[PDB]
Design a protein around this nucleic acid. Structure first.
Lengths: 106, 72, 84, 95, 98, 97, 87, 95, 106, 77
DNA sequence: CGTTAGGCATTAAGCTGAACGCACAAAGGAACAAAATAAACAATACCACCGAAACAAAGAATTAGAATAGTATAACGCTAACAAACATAAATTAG
DNA sequence: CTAATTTATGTTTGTTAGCGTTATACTATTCTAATTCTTTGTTTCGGTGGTATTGTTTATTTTGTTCCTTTGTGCGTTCAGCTTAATGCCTAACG
């Protein structure tokens, strides 16, 4: 009996597909077998960090769906995800609602 | 596919039945020219000739609002 | 299907500039902002569209996909999420 | 009988059901997550490739990926991701 | 005697509702016409997918909104609220644009 | 006594240092600063002299870019001087904060 | 009058005239007194970034020293490429 | 018996003597020109690689280089460089 | 009798070295034979454009050597070379001498 | 202060006595140019003229090793 | 679409002698730097104003949406044939 | 100053343009619906100019402080040639 490589690491992302994309992405001639396991691990953790904050935003808004306004909120409110995605804009995302304090009346 | 279509107005059902009429009386006619002629004839109709079509469209509108009252 | 276009920069209207401004947090907008913003938009679109046109003309194609616009915005360093 | 789109759409949903069972997701947000996954894959693989070139290494192993992770991802995200990764390779090598 | 608001009072409510809402603020058809007007000069007779014009509209709105945020930063810095075109040119100059 | 007007010497130094291509940071204190910061990330970190020269050159370039942007922002606000709010604005608009 | 010595505080080494010269190169007619500490912090965090990247570079290669090429590669990734120190 | 530094130092001097016979050059400016040559080579080859990937081409021919030249180099530099390039391939294919 | 590929195109830059760098740079699996000829052509033209302006700057300064101050001058004074090398700084190059007109006295 | 100084080599004592010579024969001279000229002259000396200086430096080295036989250099921070 | 059992050929860990790189001895004004000060000009606080931008109601004019047909075009699959990688012998060149 | 690095010739091979077809989304047309852009008349308020106080920078002189450029020696770091186990890629099979 044989078990898949995605759950050999105990993950969800497919190790075989990221292995194939590292091969055919033309990044090197050879690629180590730990490379796709590591890359799928960090990817799955990364999307876990996105989706957890997104679910907390959507549940904070008393909604039950993740619309990209929630993704933009979850990314722009964070500190160390804002640095990863600072240049990237989000389709139909809107902005983080913040108004300068001098524009507001007293 | 779950997409709710727009209800037909007067001119669409009128041009539908009249285009079916023209396609059962005339072969070899391109439909853009058909629709040009149908718009031309609909604008040379008197308003006394259109009240059944607009009333039927109003019946479809009340059926639509009664079918989906919380629709936006 | 042959046609030439002209004066399409007035189609992006002034109370449609004011909404893009008031999304960004602007409280008051002067009168001379509009033509300058239209020119900024024009040069930005010219850069990204020229990049997209070169992308699609390399592929021996005749239409402009959204993937090539995404690559053109990637080359300027403004990555777009949501189209592949 | 259309040719099929190779994408990361199922696994984002699997992760979502692991982390949030009640809330659903749109389709366009799933496309955004697919584009984000491909963007981060490109960033990490590009830094790993240029690191293997700067050291004249013809093989990208997990060390290069780990160094690239420490390069790109700022703050605690770096060490959290490294801990997840080393957990993953220890899982993969223990089996 | 009708009731009138004050300048700025309605503006904050508009700022809030547009920061909350995520739609596009310029209409799709003038953007289609403008994109097809501009792309004549690089190659005539181009077909534009609707998704491509939508992506261009998304990035256009994002770029102008970011530029107007920087414009507001610069106009606030000079102790103004009414932004001016020199603020736009400055915020483009600092940004590495020109 | 005949003291110069305030800023005329500053203008002559502006033209002199802009006409000059010299390094304006002394090498020993920059070496001390680099080997003081880099210990916090890892200990036993010797540096090549070319590396610290490169760091000094790049910090010079980054600071003169920051300062021309700062003077742009200060002139924009009708100010000849430089205040730290100008540096804050020039770092914010560049997208570095 | 008498010379003052302060333990550590290496950022302080970047002296005040060696910053007035950096701003005179930038074309600055007047500098207020509150600029030097802020510029020191800016230089400190800049060097923190570049040094951390170069340290990760030379640590990946298991080298105890910091060569020049590592600083070039660390500055390349922030959008400020150095010419002259080799490719 | 040192191993030798592979660099573009001779050919920059050859071009300089073709274009300016009287003026000499420093060594550090020659290093700057070498770094500039490598930077531009990296830019052009990276755009050519990603263009061959976006079209699923496994071969980089002169078309990709020409498109990348039209992409990066702004203004008249683009068409001047393209004219020089096509002159070069016509020279290389005529012989 | 055989003639080199650099002068087959009538150039100075070596076609073989740029061919080898395109191969070993890991940009694709295959590379066309016109690619290195084109790349050497545009490179040689590019360094011609640099060195011509540099020689005119150094002769304008009544010097006989190219120091990198001349390279920085030749690059920053240009319009379409400043866009190519806008982010790049130059070692020991200095700045383009220009003073804002409001700082200058009247 | 307890700090053990490095012993002088040939060039340091040679430049010391020759710089004292130049400073008793020449006024108004900057010491960097002095040391530049002293390095220049030391590199145009023949090796036949330097054996007393290197031998004296070797005497200082044997005096140093006889004075501290269990000595090893320890760089600190 | 994804995983797994054996070669084999490439590749990184291991090791040692050798070459590199850096600090430092004296020198001794030169060049720099800190500190105290006169004051002069720049930042700023305050006030008036006026014209410029916001607000509002009406209508116009434009976009949205849909049905639909043509329809250029793009995206699928065979096929040749062509161009590029690879194995092996000069040469010039260059650090 | 002669090894070494580019160049040429034939072979395999694997990529790609040519071709056909077809589907498919694109463009155009004509209707209603709606919605929103532009005009015109308030109205009110912020950018800008002008003046006065003040606060702080600059330019300078004095007095420390350091630095700088020179060669040989000691020591720690890196690197390159050679050994050697590790490993990843290819093929065949299976699910």
């Amino acid at each position: 009996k044989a078990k898949t490589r995605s759950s050999r690491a105990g993950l969800q992302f497919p190790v075989g597909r990221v292995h194939r994309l590292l091969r055919k992405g033309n990044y090197s001639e050879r690629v180590g077998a730990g490379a796709p396991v590591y890359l799928a691990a960090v990817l799955e953790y990364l999307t876990a960090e996105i989706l957890e904050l997104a679910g907390n935003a959507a549940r904070d808004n008393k909604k039950t769906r993740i619309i990209p306004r929630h993704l933009q909120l979850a990314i722009r409110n964070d500190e160390e995800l804002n640095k990863l995605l600072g240049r990237v804009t989000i389709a139909q995302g809107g902005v983080l609602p913040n108004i300068q304090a001098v524009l507001l009346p007293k | 596919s779950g997409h709710i279509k727009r209800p037909m107005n007067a001119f669409m059902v009128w041009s539908k039945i009249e285009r079916r009429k023209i396609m059962e009386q005339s072969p070899d006619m391109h439909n853009a020219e058909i629709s040009k002629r149908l718009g031309k004839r609909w604008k040379m109709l008197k308003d006394s000739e259109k009240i059944p079509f607009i009333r039927e469209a109003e019946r479809l509108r009340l059926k639509h609002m009664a079918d989906y009252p919380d629709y936006k | 299907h042959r046609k030439v276009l002209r004066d399409n920069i007035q189609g992006i209207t002034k109370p449609a500039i004011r909404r893009l401004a008031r999304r960004g947090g602007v409280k008051r907008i002067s009168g001379l902002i509009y033509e300058e913003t239209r020119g900024v938009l024009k040069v930005f679109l010219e850069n990204v569209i020229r990049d997209a046109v070169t992308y699609t003309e390399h592929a021996k194609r005749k239409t402009v996909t959204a993937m090539d616009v995404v690559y053109a915005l990637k080359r300027q360093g403004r990555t777009l999420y949501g189209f592949g | 009988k259309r040719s099929r789109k190779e994408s990361y759409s199922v696994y984002v949903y699997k992760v979502l059901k692991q982390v949030h069972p009640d809330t659903g997701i749109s389709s366009k947000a799933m496309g955004i997550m697919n584009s984000f996954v491909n963007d981060i894959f490109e960033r990490i693989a590009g830094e790993a490739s240029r690191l293997a070139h700067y050291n004249k290494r013809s093989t990208i192993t997990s060390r290069e990926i780990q160094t690239a992770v420490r390069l790109l991802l700022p703050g605690e995200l770096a060490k959290h991701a490294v801990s997840e990764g080393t957990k993953a390779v220890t899982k993969y090598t223990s089996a | 005697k009708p009731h009138r608001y004050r300048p700025g009072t309605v503006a904050l409510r508009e700022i809030r509702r547009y920061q909350k809402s995520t739609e596009l603020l310029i209409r799709k058809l003038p953007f289609q016409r403008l994109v097809r007007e501009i792309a004549q000069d690089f190659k005539t007779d181009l077909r534009f997918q609707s998704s491509a014009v939508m992506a261009l509209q998304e990035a256009s709105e994002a770029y102008l909104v970011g530029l107007f945020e920087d414009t507001n930063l610069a106009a606030i810095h000079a102790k103004r609220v009414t932004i001016m075109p020199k603020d736009i040119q400055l915020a483009r100059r600092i940004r590495g644009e020109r």
